[PDB]
């Protein structure tokens, strides 16, 4: 039955990325912003290799990102959709049923502004999934998800439109 309780779409995780191009104080302040928003200590990502054009070097701490799950993820997602005034594009949804958007100022989310911190843009990505994804993530007897149980673009788009009364553009 396609109308089964366990086939319910719901958010798996939300990942918040700030890719400040340099290392030092600015990256630290981006990490402070992320720890403020999520309430969890974020983790800093190192450059995989050196590019002179981008002004980065190998193993230089470039970006910072954090993963949130549960009610806090829902709150942050709707807080970010308010900034987007609940209007994404069809191109924002991947073939695997995940979607993302990017804000440009972190004070638009609804947190206090500090001159020392400044303003950082931010990247939002939501990983969608039904119940039973633990099969692909558990240690013992790991397997794959059946085709009907897979998350795709259309189901995620319809679920987002229904649950948020928003519009998914396609320009």
């Amino acid at each position: 039955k396609s109308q089964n309780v366990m086939r319910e779409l719901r958010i798996e995780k939300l990942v918040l990325n700030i890719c400040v191009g340099e290392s030092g104080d600015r990256l630290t302040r981006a990490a402070k912003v992320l720890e403020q928003l999520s309430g969890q200590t974020p983790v800093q990502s190192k450059a995989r290799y050196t590019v002179r054009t981008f002004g980065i070097r190998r193993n230089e701490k470039i970006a910072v990102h954090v993963t949130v799950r549960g009610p806090k993820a829902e709150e942050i997602l709707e807080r970010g959709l308010k900034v987007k005034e609940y209007q994404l594009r069809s191109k924002n949804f991947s073939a695997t049923g995940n979607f993302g958007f990017g804000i440009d100022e972190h004070i638009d989310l609804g947190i206090k502004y500090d001159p020392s911190i400044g303003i950082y843009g931010m990247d939002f990505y939501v990983v969608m999934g039904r119940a039973g994804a633990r099969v692909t993530r558990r240690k013992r007897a790991r397997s794959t998800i059946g085709n009907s149980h897979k998350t795709n673009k259309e189901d995620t788009i319809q679920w987002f439109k229904t649950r948020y009364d928003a519009e998914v553009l396609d320009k």
């Binding site: 983790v43 290799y49 590019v51």
Partner: peptide
């Protein structure tokens, strides 16, 4: 605090293939 760990093995990369200009 905490930082991402190197899941990859391209130790002596420092660049990448496919990254060709004019492409």
């Amino acid at each position: 605090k905490n930082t991402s760990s190197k899941k990859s093995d391209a130790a002596p990369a420092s660049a990448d293939p496919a990254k060709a200009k004019k492409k």
